[PDB]
Amino acid sequence: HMELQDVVVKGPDEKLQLAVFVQNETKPCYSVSYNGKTMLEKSPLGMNTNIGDFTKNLKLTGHSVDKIDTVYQQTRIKVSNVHYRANELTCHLENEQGQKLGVIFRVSDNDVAFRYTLPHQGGKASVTVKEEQTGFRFPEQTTTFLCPQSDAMIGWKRTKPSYEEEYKADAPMSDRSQYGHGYTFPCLFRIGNDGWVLVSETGVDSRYCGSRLSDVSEGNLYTVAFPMAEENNGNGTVAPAFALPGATPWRTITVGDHLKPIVETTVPWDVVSPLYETKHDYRFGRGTWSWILWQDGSINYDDQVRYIDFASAMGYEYALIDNWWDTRIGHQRMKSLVEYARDKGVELFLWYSSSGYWNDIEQGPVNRMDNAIIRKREMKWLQSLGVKGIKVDFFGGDKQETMRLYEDILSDADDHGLMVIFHGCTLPRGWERMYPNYVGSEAVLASENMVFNQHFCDEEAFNTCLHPFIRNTVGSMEFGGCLLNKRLNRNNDGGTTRRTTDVFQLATTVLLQNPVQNFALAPNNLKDVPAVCMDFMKRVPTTWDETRFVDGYPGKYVVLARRQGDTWYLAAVNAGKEPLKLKLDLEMFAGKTVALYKDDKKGEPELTSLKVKENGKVQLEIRPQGGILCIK
Ligand SMILES: [Ca+2]
């Protein structure tokens, strides 16, 4: 009947369609459909800017279309080779004053990435974007899987926000956020029975701020919100500023009738490029990590010797030395520790606080990463020692000032051949491709919380069944998983109690992806953990060539297969309270004999063999809080 769209752009197979409404509309907007079903209703576009307003009553003066068809290679993500095929719509907009603004849509089969461009105009060479009107409006029956943005300057030593909040599964849209500050990316929506939508953003660097979703308004609308003024302890302004001609980051919409495109999406990397070339061949792998289970009491020379030895015995590439080391071990003895590790075929990652001036962190070393002079001095020392990586913690929030800090740290690091892990940090936004030496981020309730609180032990399976669909699907997640201890303290006889099985934990090494994995193993595990588990952990990969979603539902259960070289790893876990019965079609395992890790009826780990017939017909039952792993 009566159609108002100015122009329509489709994905290559034409299932995904995006329509644009600008002409004669008070508020410029777009809408999204998949297989003819409305996935996003009319959602606002535009922005408010210190050279002009692009919020209301725009004209679409013209448009252009192009076909993108390229191949790119990317390490440190869920797949190693991407054939990117999309259709690009460029819209040229004008406000009543005649000021100009571009909007670009790139639509692949199951993803939309869009951004604004601002040309040099009005004698202006720079701009401050006061606000984005950019929005996402959903069908009435839509439910949500969101974690809230916290207040600023709360939590441990006033270090929040730190992207460390809890989810609600299938929540009503009308629900109010826990703190009244909306939700951090990425954000998962179930469109009734018509499939799924994941909202995020990518290509955020020093030229913008990190963004998030507001609370709902009008019953169904989420608006792109800029960081809160109280972040970074009130230092630095909220509104992002950049040179003209310039652009906003990419807003991303992963949409499908199934969970498969959600899990397998590469849109955080589809629309960004490396910001520098590296001369270093960065080696990824596995680390031992004393602090997770042995905590602050482990930060001393002899215990670090113990974990270095443990890494050597495990054949692990790295050992992570955590907070307090500069004061309880010292820079001087660190050299002999590094030498000792090298003689054992082990290299080190060292913990640093990013923090200089915005919080109350005392754990050191502090003030070695915020000042470029001091930072480069430090990194020269690190490189001269042959330290291979750093873990940088406790950042100041989402303000562009903090983005500047992230990027500059990464750049100096690369100049000194150092890999970088971020903790106490924001969500990575396509950062693996943008930064050659980036090797992962926290931005999640990590395994440390299970050590801290029994609640997070009880919730482990639920969150594990969330991450492949949400947090981890858009980027590396340094979770610190695989706890083979039964009791989460040093002597394995106190503290919190793991609620999941060993095979669950093993499966979690495949489910949760990060290039440099610092697992929560401990030396005592070589004595008090069944040999098959430790044997597996000796062969665990941390990098992948391909990832295939097999089955699952967010927060309930998850089944995925990941390939390294010619070897396929299928991992599944169950967060339900009733046993889970799977009939799977596994092309992977053809007519082959696979190695099967399973919970025995008593819940203990068992390794057997399983013949998968030419039909690919596998059948399996998974106990609650349990898992299954197939390798061939
Ligand atoms: Ca943390």
Provide a compact summary of the structure.
This protein has 632 residues and is of the alpha+beta class. Helices cover 19% and strands 33% of the residues. It is classed as hydrolase.
Structural write-up:
The protein is an alpha+beta fold and 632 residues long. It folds into three domains: 1-272, no CATH class; 273-543, no CATH class; 544-632, no CATH class. It has 15 helices and 36 strands. Strands 7, 8, 9, 10, 13, 14, 15, 16, 20 and 21 form a ten-stranded antiparallel beta sheet that branches. Strands 27-26-25-24-23-22-28 form a seven-stranded parallel beta sheet. A hairpin with a 3-residue loop joins β9 (100-107) and β10. α4 (301-314) packs parallel to α6 (331-343). The protein is globular, with a radius of gyration of 24 Å. The N and C termini lie far apart (55 Å). 53% of the residues are buried.
